Symmetry: none
Subunit: 185 residues, 2 copies
Amino acid sequence: SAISVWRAVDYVRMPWKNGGGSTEEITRDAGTGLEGFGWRLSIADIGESGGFSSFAGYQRVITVIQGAGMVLTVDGEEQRGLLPLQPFAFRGDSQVSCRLITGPIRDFNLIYSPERYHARLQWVDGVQRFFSTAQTVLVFSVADEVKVLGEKLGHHDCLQVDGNAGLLDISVTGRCCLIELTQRG
Amino acid sequence: AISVWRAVDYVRMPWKNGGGSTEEITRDAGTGLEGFGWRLSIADIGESGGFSSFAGYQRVITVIQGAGMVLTVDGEEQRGLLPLQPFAFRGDSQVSCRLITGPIRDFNLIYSPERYHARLQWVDGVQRFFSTAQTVLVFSVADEVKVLGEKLGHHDCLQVDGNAGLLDISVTGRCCLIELTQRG
């Protein structure tokens, strides 16, 4: 139905309050409410070790997309290593800090409200084909050319399908992340 | 192919400098190298200050809420923008805005002239036109604009995509007509 292509050359980089990194917003839900937000997609540049903000009540899934990896500590559990393209889910409630090992990292970030949205996320490669009733489908490229729905996405470009109301049949070729989001009733 | 974008759904993003925010309406598919080739949006200008530049692009902006503001373009004398008065300027210009009676919202067109042919016209009443343009956009500033069997409310936007013949379009009500066609 309604296809949008977010080109990474258009993303606006915004320094974090604290000076330790910056965020490029890709896209997000269209709600307005003072009552919290529904879902947001972004790229975070992490330039220093330190603590992350918390987002109480939200679910997060983050993935290293540039640089060699970093280590997270979540709620003082044992340290966890994040390698490139390995997705990692955690609660926004959690207290989280990051230790850079090889220097700065860029992360692909999904955050959503589980009260408000159903969600799916999967990193894929090669030739893929799926059918989905999801209202919003997102395709985020980590390759020079990901082909999807007649568009060609370069590195960190993102295709978005919105307002779907039947069963979508989507083929994708290349290395990318597939996200699907649907408002809960 | 007809889509209708509803204003209640426009995604709003705050500006890097904190002086305002922008609501996305619609944009082309763009290129990986150059980004979008055209974009429609609504700029909510909360404070006086400078605009970003877009070297190589052409802009047309229109005040759509508030009583107006004053633009300074490069060395030119100040220019007053009144409601619904479109103003064209180059993206490579250095432009700043002085608010006079408080915040303003502008309907913004930007396009790449290397990539697109363009047309813009604010209209009212009953209109009929024929166009070969690839993309036809109709942005409403009324409670009801009728076009192509649709009804647009305040700040809603109709989009016709992939047109390949001579489209015959009737429109009723106060709105902005934009036509965009990829250039070889």
